[PDB]
Structures are given as C-alpha cells and as structure tokens.
C-alpha cells in the first residue's frame, strides 16, 4: 500500500514548459507503470500518457512521460504550453491489490487572449406559440473570459422578470458559452414591437432585437 | 477494440440501492478483468471495485462487483445510499494493450424531487442567416437531477460534428438549465428536410424536431 503525491496547482503562460511531479511513498516508482490522464471541466478523463512514456493516438507530442528513479518519482512534462492544456492531471499506477491515483495537479494557463461573445437571438417559434408558450433564448458563445451580464428590453423598457442565464461553461474551442432564456406569454411576446438582449463583456455590449413575424 | 456502454446517469434515495451497468459491445465480459472507479465532482480518482468484484482495503461492502455473462455486462451495486457516494462511476477493461473505459455513469443521491426539462428547439435567426450562419438552439430547463445527454440528427442520421452542449447550472428554481447548439452553414440548413433534438434525462427520451420556411 503507498499513496502518490502530485502538487496540488502549478501556472504557467502559452509557450512555455511545465512539469507535473508523482512522487510514490512507498515502494519503488519503477516496480509498476504510471499512467497519466487530462481531465477538462465537465469532461471524462482521457489518458495522455501509459506505461510510463507512451502516448495513445491523438495525443500531442507536446506531452512526455518520464521516471526518475532517484527521487522515487514520475513526470508528466507539457512543453509549447496551449490554452486547451488548462484542465486536472492525475498520475496512476497498480499495488496488485490496486489501481491507485495522485490527488490530481490543477494546470492554469496564464494571459489567454479575451474573445468577445457571438450574439445570437432567438424569437419563440410558431409550435411553441401554439402550445401557449413564448420563450426567447440569447445564445452566447466564444467568450473569454468566462463572465458575462445580461440584460432585456421589452420595446425600450427594462424587462425584471422571468429571466435565466446559466453559468458558462468552457466548450470544446476553450472559450465559454451560456444562454439566456425569457419566459414570456404569447400576449406579452405580442404586445411588444420588439424584444432584445443586450450582452456585456468586459465593458463592451452587444445588442440583438427580434419582433413578432407576419406571414 | 471494444466499447463499454454504461447508462448516462442513475439516482436514488438515501439508503436505497442502485446498480449501474456496463455492456461490452463486442467479446466477452469475462475474457478479461473489470475495474470500477468513482469520482466525486472535484476529487481525484479512486478505484472501488478491481478484478470483477474485489474491493481494495477501506472501500466498505456497500459497494458490490458482478459479471453477467448472459447480458456480457457488469455492474455495480450501491446498498444504503450515501450523500458521499454522489459521483461519477467508470467501468474499465482491456483486449490485450487495448485498455477500454466506459463513458461514466453519474449517480445523483436525490437532494429534492426528480423534475422532468422542458424542451424548446428553434430554427435558425433570420438576422444570423444574412451573417452566413444557421445555428440551431435546444434549451433545456427546469430539470433534476442536473445530468442530461443530447444527441443530434439531420432528418435521421446521428449528427456529431458541432454539436455543443453547457454544463448544466443551478438557476433561481433550484432546478438546472442548459442549452444544445449545433452550428450549421445555412445550405446544410436547406440540404435537409428536417434536424432533431434527443434530450435523455432520467428514463426518458424527449424529442423536437424543425424544419426550413419562410416567416
Ligand atoms: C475516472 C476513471 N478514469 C481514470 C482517469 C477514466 C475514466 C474514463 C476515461 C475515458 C472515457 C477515456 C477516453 C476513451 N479511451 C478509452 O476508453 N481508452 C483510451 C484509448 C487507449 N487508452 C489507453 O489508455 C491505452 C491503450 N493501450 C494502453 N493504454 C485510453 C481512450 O482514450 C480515457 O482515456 O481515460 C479515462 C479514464
């Protein structure tokens, strides 16, 4: 029985190199494989290194494994650091009575470039009328850093009710997405001219409108 | 090589039992060893159940292994439901090098009544299509637990490439709220006579469909 410890949170900027140390306390490091897996928030783990130094397909040759037997120790080393690298590290390796795991390093990357959100509104459909609902929903997207504020117009007036918007979350291009929804009646959605959604990212607002469609 | 298919998410009462299943698509179940992990949302890894049914030291009996070769699935056996024991679960076994992991199962231990999404899918904004875009929506809303899969299609063939999903968040309900977008050109739009929705939560599958017009 020994346990691996990993740091508990290393930084480093785009470019550059960064080493993840597994240090095992008891035994030694070279009695059995480590493994290494890269885990994204609100993602599954995918291994990035077996068997000390083996690299699955699809993996980038930016990730090396090594073994340091002197200080009873495995390395993950990410050289030519990208922002997709941001996410947990977990070392692992067997006891015969286990398959045991570091307590994980978290990776931050340092100075990743703003991106202002992709806007898009989207007015209540006609099934959705017809089943006496209006919903509206403000698709935002491709933003960094990860907060936005929302606000909504009925005409030019400020709507204080029945509005959502969800925690971002990163997607699989690393920067945020969210929505935010207003719940309205058909008659309310009818009685205005229009709706917008007005987006503000690190000062700067984005605005979209909609308005009712005749045929 | 293999998959491992495990169902997306699982929930049960404190003290109450809950088996979480693992199919083997292609060989058989017992050719080689099942190992199963779980990870609580922000821990590391551990390993509950190694070798089919064996539990390292500390993990407690509540926890229970088992091959069925009639089905070629395992499974595992949560009795006396604990708060703690809310996390992800991995099934994991091997042809040979080839080491197979199942998607995961997300196990919520019920904090407040199961609470079915409401579904809402829209067509592409006019004012995006004059940008060269066609982006569908599906907003999902008001639902717990707060573990749902999407899954796409273009009239009936399974979509894959963007599709992006949110982590779903806690909104002023209590209940969790996130939203599905698929990014289309607009003439793979026309190209097809309709897309769909499948939003799986909780032994359900709910579907929406849209289609091109103009209005
Ligand atoms: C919490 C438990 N845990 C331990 C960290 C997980 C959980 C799920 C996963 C998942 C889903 C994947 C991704 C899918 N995938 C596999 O099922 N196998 C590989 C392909 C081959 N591979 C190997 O490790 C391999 C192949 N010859 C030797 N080793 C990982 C893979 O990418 C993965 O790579 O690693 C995982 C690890």
Redesign the pocket.
Known sequence: NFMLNQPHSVSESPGKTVTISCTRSSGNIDSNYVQW?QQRPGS????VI?EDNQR?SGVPDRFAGSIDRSSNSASLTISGLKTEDEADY?C?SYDARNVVFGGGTRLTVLGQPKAAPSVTLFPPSSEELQANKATLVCLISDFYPGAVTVAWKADSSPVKAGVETTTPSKQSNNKYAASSYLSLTPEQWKSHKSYSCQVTHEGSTVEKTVAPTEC
């Open positions: 897996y599954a783990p995918i291994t077996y699955p977990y692992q």
